[PDB]
Amino acid sequence: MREIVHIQAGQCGNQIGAKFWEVISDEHGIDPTGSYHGDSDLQLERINVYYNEATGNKYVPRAILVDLEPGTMDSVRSGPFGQIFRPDNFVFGQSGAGNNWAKGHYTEGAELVDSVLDVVRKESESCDCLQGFQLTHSLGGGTGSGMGTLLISKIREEYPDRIMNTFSVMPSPKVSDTVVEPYNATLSVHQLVENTDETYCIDNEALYDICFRTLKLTTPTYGDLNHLVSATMSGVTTCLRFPGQLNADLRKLAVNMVPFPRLHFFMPGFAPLTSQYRALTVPELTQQMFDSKNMMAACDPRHGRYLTVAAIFRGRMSMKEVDEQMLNVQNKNSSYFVEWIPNNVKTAVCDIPPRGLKMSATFIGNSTAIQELFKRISEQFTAMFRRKAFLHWYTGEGMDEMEFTEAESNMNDLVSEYQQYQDATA
Amino acid sequence: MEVIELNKCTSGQSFEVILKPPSDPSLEEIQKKLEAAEERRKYQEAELLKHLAE
Amino acid sequence: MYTFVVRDENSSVYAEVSRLLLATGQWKRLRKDNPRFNLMLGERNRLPFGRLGHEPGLVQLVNYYRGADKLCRKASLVKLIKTSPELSESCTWFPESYVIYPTNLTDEREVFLAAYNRRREGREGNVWIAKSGILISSEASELLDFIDEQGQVHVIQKYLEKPLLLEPGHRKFDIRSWVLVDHLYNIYLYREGVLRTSSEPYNSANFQDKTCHLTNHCIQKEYSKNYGRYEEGNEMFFEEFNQYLMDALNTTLENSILLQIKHIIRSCLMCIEPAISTKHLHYQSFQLFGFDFMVDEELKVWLIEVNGAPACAQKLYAELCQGIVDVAISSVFPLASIFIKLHHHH
Amino acid sequence: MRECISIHVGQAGVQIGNACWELYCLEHGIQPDGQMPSDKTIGGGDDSFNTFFSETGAGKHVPRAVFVDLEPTVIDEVRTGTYRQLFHPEQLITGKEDAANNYARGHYTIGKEIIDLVLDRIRKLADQCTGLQGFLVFHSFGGGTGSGFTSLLMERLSVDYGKKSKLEFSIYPAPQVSTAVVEPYNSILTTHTTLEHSDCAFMVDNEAIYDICRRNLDIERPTYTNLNRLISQIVSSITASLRFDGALNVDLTEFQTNLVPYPRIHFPLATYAPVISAEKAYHEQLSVAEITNACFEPANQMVKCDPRHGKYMACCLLYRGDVVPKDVNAAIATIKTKRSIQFVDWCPTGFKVGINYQPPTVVPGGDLAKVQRAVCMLSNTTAIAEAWARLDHKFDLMYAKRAFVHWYVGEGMEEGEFSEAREDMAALEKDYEEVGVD
């Protein structure tokens, strides 16, 4: 009984969160009304990790939906599995955050944070033994970014020894809503470096490129990008939701994936990504999964080195052939794996494949290549900040310039820390 | 090549064959260790909550 | 795509093997500390055999046999020949030798004197050579005082007073043979050997000047005054040496000497095979050896020593180093005969 | 009759313990409900098997075992498995959350809160023993509980039971069957603080058990169940002398007396043969000479190393099945003429031999074939130091960057314990070389 409390905040956070519950509810046999209609005991084995059990055999997601405007959570409540969510777990305001980190973190968000924690506390008080928390949000807006990181800070204060996990959508000028995204992202990365234990970086540019070039989607939509996020989220949580010879709770994952506390930002990858009925052999899954075009970080792993790698293979396949393929990828590209962490590539197998797939592979890498994602943000940030462009939106909410300088210095330090271990040798 | 100490019973036997002759911390101390580690965990937590209170 | 690491930057041999491996476009060299390798060109001293063969999915191979030092150590070889029933103390191709420890430190001091006195009383030639800094003397009092002034172990063996002298020149020489043992413990003899000849006339009435007695390439090119007269670099190859044996002795290198060399190589290597074989081991070994021989005036071949990290003759590096890649490395890591197999019972 | 209490710590210890007691029951004719028809003394008796089993008035034969884990999911398998009836609930102890593969967490943070309870439960077993010999402690090196809490338990045991032997069955970390990266840290931390408290420790390298299961049993990808049944065969071979009538290794103190000349060098090498696939059409039954010779093949060793290049200090041959002393000495003589068996100059070149006529028992439907004779050789070789070198090298690579160190410091451990523990292993490696190398 290792329960996880899920929190989804802001527009992006709730749209990706909704599709995630839609995906795993299907995998666990839960229908849109909370009733289990599965055919395997493996589906109910670890069902309590993400779902609460009510009367009448109903399963209710342990999910808290947060936003500063009602629009997005109304769409969820009326969406496919909207009925499945606990009515009391909808916590929203009316003002909105105006894509302004300071509003979500300081002004509008502070006015709403206490009631979110009341719901968080209610969910935690009923867990037999709480693993930790997972947050879905974007970094480029105001609510998920600014209030999201405020919620993390207060959860740290009340649950200092629980694992704090996030799925964080990084902005990109190619898939941008506002010019202030680099400001909001830089401020959030500062909070994340200090308060989260594991952050899966999801780059909207990578999601876009994959939809355009690999999937052959002429005009991708946010819905298309969120399908990749749903799939990736289901993959990285497979070994928490299903039985296997792996166990793996949140803390044990962090211990083996994070050699240094600041460097806890992961690049996730998924395969297949086909535009379809063809059977994909194990070598095809492993070549694709590790290809850059299959990664959601918009970072070229060949530009850095893997500190640690964790992969899961789903479906009925040769477990011997899986080891042969994973061992072949490292022993044929050894320059991109650090040699001072023995056996830093680990693989797990699960027999239940995702919906509509004979088999799949998801992997997370703690790679120093991620530094290029932070360099891009830092570049866009300084271009505007050097001229103080758009700052009045933030100073008008009580923030001072010094707080921007601190967040920038800290993120630039993070880049230097990655570059330090990228050159390290035995 | 000598055998010695041949013991036999109903469920087996045992013998020796020679081929060539030759040529703590107290309970208190453990408590201090544990409680010292607990204290250092309390200090680190205090610095977190102190940092968070600021 | 195979990977290897180099850990002996002073090996002229495996530097060429390294330069060849990379030339095939199918081998990738890693840092000397990267443990994810298929092939290790290891260090001469303290090679960490204990860490080989524990990488999942990696078949690992090393260019040294753990335990071959029993053969390539002066003192170790003497003990091995005297204590191994396969070789016995009656071994007819190894000079009478004794392990002697300096007095400032088992030891065969007295046993050496017993044989020496026998030779002095019987008028027989009683000259010996000590080594571990070499000294040749016909008096026992001198050889022992030389080992005590040092601090390491020394061996004293009979000096071959009747060596085969090449003509013209009336000069000494030794024979170097290269032998490659692969992971299957096949014993391969390189078809090419070299003679390291003395450029000075052999003088049996004066062991003070060690230039006509020590045929080492370093002692001839530094102290000898006739370097390169008879043969370039004081090195004569089998083709010339064989033709000389036919013109002078009306015999052949194969019949007169090479059969004995092959017998000695087999005897030494088969003796230690149970102790060093990697057949049933989690990692695989191969190794190149340098056997040093002496031929006497009766055309009897004597074993001098066995070098575990030998160099090669400049004119023979290319062919031999390619042969190491062919039979030793590619045999285990195939890509996309210059040796003589000395068959035996495994 | 003197009792032996088995302690199983963490996932590996518990799952191995489950596989051993299953085997013990089949070996002594005990059903899963605890009943033993062959036992004519009801509710008591001082037979040989009573060293490991107590008796209730109702005729149940209860293992003298304690199962301890900081998380309940593995022990809950014992509570509802086939042998749920053998143990009463007090013997199965489980916490709420594990040590997350963090030695410091199992030793300091969580160990501090559950140690007194585990001692209390063990005291309940000691009070049932008229003459307790000592403890057998099963655990992994890599787990946060198997490494961290075990070392704390071993310290307390030396306090509460000073004059009692303690033996270890330790699982040495292998990458092929582990998803943890910090196990070299845990292995060295636990060995350092446990060294002075363990009298004899049998390391089993998962790499060796994995290869034997792929090579001999033809399992493409062995599971923990496959590995644990093979391991329990070796444990059974080693503990059979305490559970059956015999004259060799009759009490725990004999393992130290026969196998450990120097206290720090208390890690004997185990070799077992034959391992035969049950799915095989039908194997040709091996002889005493053949299985004895197999004891000197690295492929049958619980830890892969080269005993040819170490030195032996002691050597024990434990046979089970159709074996007579005549065949043993004849096979031994032959092996000395063909093998590189070098003893230290201050030890006799001999073998202690034990034969139990009852052949190896195998779990029905398992992977192991029923054989007429098997042998387990326990030898104290300097060659097992190779395992410390391998482990120490992995430790050095990560510690040179302080990788993962923060996780231990965060739980209350001082960074100085890493270097103190590493320097102890450097000295242990030096001791092995002072005895074996010339």
Ligand SMILES: Nc1nc2c(ncn2[C@@H]2O[C@H](COP(=O)(O)OP(=O)(O)OP(=O)(O)O)[C@@H](O)[C@H]2O)c(=O)[nH]1
């Ligand atoms: N042979 C064998 N090894 C096991 C078994 N279970 C775990 N291991 C090994 O033990 C190591 C991991 O330690 P665990 O025993 O699982 O961890 P733990 O002792 O429960 O402590 P925690 O970290 O709190 O979970 C890895 O090297 C595994 O390969 C088992 O059943 N048999």
Ligand SMILES: Nc1ncnc2c1ncn2[C@@H]1O[C@H](COP(=O)(O)OP(=O)(O)CP(=O)(O)O)[C@@H](O)[C@H]1O
């Ligand atoms: N018993 C003996 N009788 C005659 N000559 C001998 C001899 N022992 C050594 N030599 C001479 O010494 C030379 C070999 O010396 P040795 O090989 O022992 O020293 P070393 O090992 O430092 C040189 P290398 O290893 O390169 O061959 C030979 O050329 C030989 O002529």
Ligand SMILES: Nc1nc2c(ncn2[C@@H]2O[C@H](COP(=O)(O)OP(=O)(O)O)[C@@H](O)[C@H]2O)c(=O)[nH]1
């Ligand atoms: N992948 C994805 N990105 C989104 C989605 N909605 C918004 N974004 C991105 O998130 C940022 C806008 O933040 P948003 O979540 O709308 O702000 P908030 O509602 O105040 O938290 C921009 O970088 C958008 O590109 C979505 O549904 N999917």
Ligand SMILES: Oc1cccc(CN2CCSCC2)c1
């Ligand atoms: O930047 C930080 C400094 C200290 C602690 C943390 C939180 N966390 C990171 C992942 S490892 C466990 C600890 C972040």
Ligand SMILES: Oc1cccc(CN2CCSCC2)c1
């Ligand atoms: O620590 C681990 C080692 C191997 C596999 C896993 C499971 N999983 C984690 C989320 S990403 C996909 C892989 C964990």
Ligand SMILES: [Ca+2]
């Ligand atoms: Ca307001």
Ligand SMILES: [Ca+2]
């Ligand atoms: Ca009884």
Ligand SMILES: [Ca+2]
């Ligand atoms: Ca003690």
Ligand SMILES: [Mg+2]
């Ligand atoms: Mg928006």
Ligand SMILES: [Mg+2]
């Ligand atoms: Mg030499």
Ligand SMILES: [Mg+2]
């Ligand atoms: Mg556990």
